[PDB]
RNA sequence: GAUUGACCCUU
RNA sequence: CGCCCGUCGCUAGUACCGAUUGAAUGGCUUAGUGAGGCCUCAGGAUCUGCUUAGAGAAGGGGGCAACUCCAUCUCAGAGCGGAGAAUUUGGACAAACUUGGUCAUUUAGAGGAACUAAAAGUCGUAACAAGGUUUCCGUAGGUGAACCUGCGGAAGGAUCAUU
RNA sequence: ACCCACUCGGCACCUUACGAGAAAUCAAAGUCUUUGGGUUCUGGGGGGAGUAUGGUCGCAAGGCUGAAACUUAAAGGAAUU
RNA sequence: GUCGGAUUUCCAACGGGGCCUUUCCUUCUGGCUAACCUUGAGCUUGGCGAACCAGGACUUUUACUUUGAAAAAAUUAGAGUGUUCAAAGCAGGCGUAUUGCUCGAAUAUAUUAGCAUGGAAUAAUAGAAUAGGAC
RNA sequence: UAUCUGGUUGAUCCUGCCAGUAGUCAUAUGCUUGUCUCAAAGAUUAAGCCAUGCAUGUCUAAGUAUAAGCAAUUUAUACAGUGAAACUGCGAAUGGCUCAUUAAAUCAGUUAUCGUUUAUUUGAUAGUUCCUUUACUACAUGGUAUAACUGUGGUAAUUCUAGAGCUAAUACAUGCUUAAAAUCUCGACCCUUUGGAAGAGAUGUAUUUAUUAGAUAAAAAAUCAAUGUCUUCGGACUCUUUGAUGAUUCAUAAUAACUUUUCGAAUCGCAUGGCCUUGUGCUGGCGAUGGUUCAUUCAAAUUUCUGCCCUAUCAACUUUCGAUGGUAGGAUAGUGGCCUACCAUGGUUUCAACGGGUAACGGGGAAUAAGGGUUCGAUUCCGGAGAGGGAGCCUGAGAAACGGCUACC
RNA sequence: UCUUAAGGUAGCCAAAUGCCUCGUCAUCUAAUUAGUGACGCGCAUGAAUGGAUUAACGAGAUUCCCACUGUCCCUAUCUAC
């Protein structure tokens, strides 16, 4: 029953607009997804001209991208930690866009070991040569190493789960890291 | 706006990714654009630190349609101001005019510094808020 | 539904209902031209006023105006087609001063009496 | 409201159909097709009024579904198929081909041509893009898409297409000193031999257009349409050659060749 | 400088 | 012998006020209820398919008689996709109602008070002449009624005038 | 200090009309059907009525704003005989 | 000169394109190579731009005022039109009459508004003054 | 047709109204009413209430016909039907009607979508794939069952209907045949530093998360962490273009590359031309549409700029959390306080906001003037709204649809 | 005119003052000698023997409404003494 017009709102001067039309099909709204973690459940809704929209509810796994390393993998989420919109969303551990979640980083660790060969936290000659050639660029900074030792990476979801049914995101690196981590440690 | 990260969210231009690998001059990237229609992009918009997703140059809005001008009457609103558009409305029966005006609210990018009484020109963009539909492109008064 | 069909009046009543001179003139005109009503006189006066207004609005425009020349040529062409204006004088005085008497004396009913086919206006 | 209209009232159709406002409460609504609703001439009116070969709608439908008509070389068995401008209507019966072009005064006139001319048609491109599979293409005024055009064809240029295959037989660029055919506004139906155009950064470019008699006007770029080079045109033009001779001249030549 | 208050019918 | 004013008396009409927590209609509502549809964790049918061990049965088969009875149909126990019609966890849209807060809105009302009208009512004679106390204005008081009086003002005065 | 030319700014006066006006009369009430220097306020037949009602100011008396219903063919302006 | 479209000494006038009168149609780099310093015995190899294009710049701002989509449809009078004339619709008209052909249904935009364009009269806070004015 | 006349007085000049006069595609009414054409016609009060009858259903040669429907052809036992019905499709969202609401709201002209959807329509055909991967299966081909056909369910009843013997899908999932260049990779070796023969996965978009080719206008100087075109170590690097508009993160594709996998024809009609190591095999045309999909349009939604009658006996209006903009999110088809968390009294206003009234739908548009125009516009055309009022929704490209459903008076 | 000097003015009223009287009309109720508002020839209202009105106040008198309840329908049970 949610509507999406402006005729129900007060005019820019503050005048109460009169009732002009009934609520219209082309300006409707729908209930929030409030998608959660675990037991992936996607519901399909038929919209204007077909155009199936995948409303996510209790998603489980998502596709996260390390932009610097130019990699992307599927990975399960460990829960949200900070939300610019609302802290109640953080408490409810719900999923929305631009939400900061934790990931277990296991596929990323496996990619790092398979592609660079540097140990984290604690063989053919040709493959060793290739790894040594790709090496000498495994020293980005200290927080990434600390997070990978911890086994939980901080990443923000860039997708719209209630629009596409996918909780796709990217891992924080650089100034967004240096901002969100100081925000979390600031208490 | 002394601090560009005074908000809860991290203010960053979409899809402008700065590689941390290099350590040289200009370690961070800024995205601007030519607004078009002959309006020059200020060096402040070129080299600033603000984000302002609604900026004509450093934002994602495209300026198209009407191009208006007027003197600002209120600047007490964040990133948006109201200009006064004075005009004369013709009345055939009496064969003369009457002073009329219309306060239109427009969005002011942090590239421009404006104050009450300044004449600014604005260009139409997509609806930015409930009332704002124009973005300032030049300040023409001191 | 269907497009409307336009209909226009063809006559006009005098502004003063009882003018002795006008009543005498109209009765004499209708008696000498064999008319059944003053509505015929009203119709002919209506078209006379229409064409006089047309001529005045034509003279409104500047001399050597294309619209003025065309519209005056059309009006004079129709006037000479009905046969009232001179075939060798383009002086337009008759155009500005056509008369109800001219229009009725050009009308058909009196044409028979003029050419001598009935010898009486009412018999015609 | 609530969905696209299917009916068309009389007095709401474009005036250049030369319809009669009486004798019927409705007008034949053009269907979606190659041209716009307003600047199109449906086969029903073309066969009932321009040609009189069909007296009413039942006969019009009889012709089209009896398959005596092909539009642009294709039958197009639709009673109100939108037949717009520059398109060729071929009738194997009577072996007669028409090119739908505006007359001097902007009404789609009957323009009989031969098989050689009816083979092809001209069309101004609408835009040049890079469609799917990375294939460059041009979308023209006819709703036609031409695949793999040469890099030099740009906007507002026109293409002459053989109408049988996808080959680009010829094209005419857009530049000063080029003959055009103005389609829209007061000047629907005039021949151009243009001189220059005003840019006016922001939209609505205009071109200055002087006919043979040194009569010069202005017409929007979206309203201009080039149909050949200077001198010889790429198609044949109907009677009067579309020069807009004033009404005094009209009566002059009528009373001359009465 | 007193007391003189009033007078039903048409252009 | 003109004209003319007001009270009072008769007749009708008009609007106004009016106790009646007057009443009847549509808008937003501090608060409190709340039908139906729509978004959401969970209980119940059925046909489908893979398999090694338990029954009744349309030719017990390698020595035709102690051992495998043939996927041939029947029966309970092992693993899964199509109905989420009985509630609802959380909700949102939101029909339908109170004591109280308005719309020159509409409308009833005992009674009160004023105005308006026509040929012939009573009482006076206030004004029009210096109208017999010049008239009139503001204000205040008084009085059957016009009106009278005080105070200030005006001339539209009955003086355009003093030596 | 008066007496005489005489500028300037005031209160006013004295004879047709240049003009205005319905006239009385008016050097403005003129320069307005040969109609526009700028600007404010007010009126739209007589009454009902400066009433009712709602505001608002007032101690009050009352002041300011302020109608309709209804009634009416005149009411008025200059004294021409 | 063609039995009133025929215009040379046309010396009776003009917004606008050029020159002198202190009175110029925006940088600086280029492509056709910019109103041309460049005679091939009779439509040219390099000095300068805006009358198309490139990028920074200004009609600091108007009001005002001629030129084109602008009131999408019938009207305004019609080259013309016999519905019994006419109101009306757009019809209609002519063959060596067995053939057949064809003109035409356009012209005013119904305030204000937004567009592009020429103009400068009619009214300026704006410049540069306790110079953080111009090459 | 730029016009006036009677009424105040004994008479006179005047402001001043009353009355007269003439129009009304304004209405009603009275009397009368013979012909020719088009003719408005329950608008005004009650967008009051409605008996009845009708007003949206519809198929071809080309989805299904095996109906105790029908008349049946023959030098073919090698496939001619019509067709009262009912399932899949499409429409029923167009028409037509009425002005109730609605006074910056509709609407008119002009803008914009570089801020979005769009069934049919047109131009356009989709080879990259066995995601337990040199076999877990049918490509001269699939799997599931309610629709038809025969008795029964209630009284006065309705467009109410159930469990049986069956049936192909264009009703619903899975699947496949192309040995046409090439990158990223796993890896027997000489024991590095111009290196090279072997076997296999991705290369269409639906999520848009990383760089780009996505540049664009002039002459000299070399030692790099990580070698390209190059081949007379003194033989050069010029070829790094796949783009119009004023403007873009706009318009392809690659090293990353997800999913509950809509899809990449398990479709119907019409005359058989050619190949044979001779089959109920192989090759070749004319017609219909779901479906990656890309572009005016029929379209819709938002959307600039200016303009709307009366009223100040309406001067301040907009509120715990929308009235203000900003940041992030959700929802939308999409922008946007359309809504959610934090941050101000921000926004409008005598140039009249806000409030009230309208016997107010708006515009095109009748009645007069070369300019005084004042009214009216329910009504034939366009844009709105509504289907007794409010609210909610399914299907559908399109509906808040009311001759579609779900709830009172 | 007469008694006896004047004849009840402004106001107010079946009033805490009106016998007739449970006055008449309206309203309030299903029904009202009650209440309130009107009307007054008022047995016998009335002007510092003060008239009329009046905000606030009242263990003053009276009417109605909401809430509340064992007053009541219609009673029952429990505790202490």
UniProtKB/Swiss-Prot annotation, chain A:
The family this protein is said to belong to: Belongs to the eukaryotic ribosomal protein eS8 family.
Modified residues (Phosphoserine): 65, 68, 72, 85, 142-143, 146, 149
Protein's UniProt name: Small ribosomal subunit protein eS8A
Organism whose genome encodes this protein: Saccharomyces cerevisiae (strain ATCC 204508 / S288c)
GO CC aspect terms: 90S preribosome; cytosol; cytosolic small ribosomal subunit
Subunit structure of this chain's protein: Component of the small ribosomal subunit (SSU). Mature yeast ribosomes consist of a small (40S) and a large (60S) subunit. The 40S small subunit contains 1 molecule of ribosomal RNA (18S rRNA) and 33 different proteins (encoded by 57 genes). The large 60S subunit contains 3 rRNA molecules (25S, 5.8S and 5S rRNA) and 46 different proteins (encoded by 81 genes).
An example molecular function term from Gene Ontology annotations: structural constituent of ribosome
Function noted in UniProt: Component of the ribosome, a large ribonucleoprotein complex responsible for the synthesis of proteins in the cell. The small ribosomal subunit (SSU) binds messenger RNAs (mRNAs) and translates the encoded message by selecting cognate aminoacyl-transfer RNA (tRNA) molecules. The large subunit (LSU) contains the ribosomal catalytic site termed the peptidyl transferase center (PTC), which catalyzes the formation of peptide bonds, thereby polymerizing the amino acids delivered by tRNAs into a polypeptide chain.
Keywords from the UniProt entry: Cytoplasm, Phosphoprotein, Ribonucleoprotein, Ribosomal protein
Region (Disordered): 1-30
Compartment(s): Cytoplasm
Record carries keyword Nucleotide-binding: no
Modified sites of kind Phosphothreonine: 61, 106
UniProtKB/Swiss-Prot annotation, chain B:
Subunit relationships: Component of the small ribosomal subunit (SSU). Mature yeast ribosomes consist of a small (40S) and a large (60S) subunit. The 40S small subunit contains 1 molecule of ribosomal RNA (18S rRNA) and 33 different proteins (encoded by 57 genes). The large 60S subunit contains 3 rRNA molecules (25S, 5.8S and 5S rRNA) and 46 different proteins (encoded by 81 genes).
Residue location of crosslink Glycyl lysine isopeptide (Lys-Gly) (interchain with G-Cter in ubiquitin): 12, 43, 53-54, 76, 93, 102, 130, 138
PTM comment, free text: N-terminally acetylated by acetyltransferase NatA.
SUPFAM superfamilies: Nucleic acid-binding proteins
Annotated signal peptide: none
Keyword Ribonucleoprotein annotated: yes
Cystine pairings recorded for this chain: none
PANTHER family: 40S RIBOSOMAL PROTEIN S11 FAMILY MEMBER (PTHR10744), 40S RIBOSOMAL PROTEIN S11-RELATED (PTHR10744:SF9)
GO annotations of cellular component type: 90S preribosome; cytosol; cytosolic small ribosomal subunit
Single GO term (MF): structural constituent of ribosome
Organism, scientific name: Saccharomyces cerevisiae (strain ATCC 204508 / S288c) (Baker's yeast)
Entry's localization field: Cytoplasm
Matching InterPro entries: NA-bd_OB-fold (IPR012340), Ribosomal_uS17 (IPR000266), Ribosomal_uS17_arc/euk (IPR028333), Ribosomal_uS17_CS (IPR019979), Ribosomal_uS17_N (IPR032440)
Note: There are 2 genes for uS17 in yeast.
Gene Ontology BP terms: maturation of SSU-rRNA from tricistronic rRNA transcript (SSU-rRNA, 5.8S rRNA, LSU-rRNA); ribosomal small subunit assembly; translation
Protein name: Small ribosomal subunit protein uS17A
Gene name linked to the record: RPS11A
Curated annotation (Swiss-Prot), chain C:
Similarity section: Belongs to the universal ribosomal protein uS4 family.
Domain of life: Eukaryota
Main location: cytoplasm
Note: Present with 106000 molecules/cell in log phase SD medium.
Subcellular location: Cytoplasm; Nucleus, Nucleolus
CC per GO annotation: 90S preribosome; cytoplasm; cytosol; cytosolic small ribosomal subunit; nucleolus; nucleoplasm; small-subunit processome
GO MF annotation list: rRNA binding; structural constituent of ribosome
Function field: Component of the ribosome, a large ribonucleoprotein complex responsible for the synthesis of proteins in the cell. The small ribosomal subunit (SSU) binds messenger RNAs (mRNAs) and translates the encoded message by selecting cognate aminoacyl-transfer RNA (tRNA) molecules. The large subunit (LSU) contains the ribosomal catalytic site termed the peptidyl transferase center (PTC), which catalyzes the formation of peptide bonds, thereby polymerizing the amino acids delivered by tRNAs into a polypeptide chain.
BP GO terms, sorted: maturation of SSU-rRNA from tricistronic rRNA transcript (SSU-rRNA, 5.8S rRNA, LSU-rRNA); ribosomal small subunit biogenesis; translation
Keyword vocabulary terms for this entry: Cytoplasm, Isopeptide bond, Nucleus, Phosphoprotein, Ribonucleoprotein, Ribosomal protein, Ribosome biogenesis, RNA-binding, rRNA processing, rRNA-binding, Ubl conjugation
Name of this protein: Small ribosomal subunit protein uS4A
Curated annotation (Swiss-Prot), chain D:
Other noteworthy facts: Present with 573 molecules/cell in log phase SD medium. There are 2 genes for eS4 in yeast.
Subunit structure: Component of the small ribosomal subunit (SSU). Mature yeast ribosomes consist of a small (40S) and a large (60S) subunit. The 40S small subunit contains 1 molecule of ribosomal RNA (18S rRNA) and 33 different proteins (encoded by 57 genes). The large 60S subunit contains 3 rRNA molecules (25S, 5.8S and 5S rRNA) and 46 different proteins (encoded by 81 genes).
Residues with Phosphothreonine modification: 114
Modified residues (Phosphoserine): 31, 246
Localization of this protein: Cytoplasm
Domain S4 RNA-binding: 41-104
Protein family (similarity comment): Belongs to the eukaryotic ribosomal protein eS4 family.
CDD domains associated with the record: KOW_RPS4, S4
Taxonomic lineage of the native organism: Eukaryota, Fungi, Dikarya, Ascomycota, Saccharomycotina
GO biological process: cytoplasmic translation; translation
Organism whose genome encodes this protein: Saccharomyces cerevisiae (strain ATCC 204508 / S288c) (Baker's yeast)
Keywords: Cytoplasm, Isopeptide bond, Phosphoprotein, Ribonucleoprotein, Ribosomal protein, RNA-binding, rRNA-binding, Ubl conjugation
Designated name of the protein: Small ribosomal subunit protein eS4A
